Amino acid sequence: PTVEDVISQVARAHREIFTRTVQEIWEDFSMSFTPAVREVVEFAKHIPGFRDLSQHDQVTLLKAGTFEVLMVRFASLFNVKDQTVMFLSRTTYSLQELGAMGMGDLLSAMFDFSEKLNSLALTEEELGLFTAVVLVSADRSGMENSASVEQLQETLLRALRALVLKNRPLETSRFTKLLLKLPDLRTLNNMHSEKLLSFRV
């Protein structure tokens, strides 16, 4: 499809789908986190070209890039000034209150990343198109057909280039600043994807 078809479709799905004791915090986390992951999978279906990939490649991409998508999606839920993170159930928590989980370092890394992402002032369209780019930009190890994924990545990368130029033409490095978040996201995934979660058994 055309670049304006990609922006319109990806941004529409982005609005439709996305937009105090240790044990109780882990139940609120689990009940917020599980639908959040499902939302990434539903958003992925609505990405022009994603369903055309083989079932294996779709699952491989979602398994590799869902943590990174959640870091971008949850970035706005981190209040850098108040030092408060809100969960998908509208419950707000202090950093200290949340220290009783494993993470600790993941939560402070998230405050820095959201702050960095905030300085860009992405419009909803831009954020939705970046979220799609993040998902298709995951490690392509174990892909039956990496070529199909690379072409899906460049289709979303061209639409993001155009949207960002349409919005802030004078800010010629806006696209660059967005591609520069990719190794930051890759470091956070490499540093924190192995951290442990607790569930009532």
């Binding site: 992951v37 079932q55 398994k63 994807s193 951290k195 442990l196 979660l197 569930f199």
Partner: peptide, 20 residues
């Protein structure tokens, strides 16, 4: 009474369960 699992494995668990 409590289960422990990495962020990656729990994500992959939700994914493989959703693709049924």
């Amino acid at each position: 009474t409590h289960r422990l699992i990495t962020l990656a494995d729990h994500i992959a668990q939700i994914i493989t369960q959703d693709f049924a």
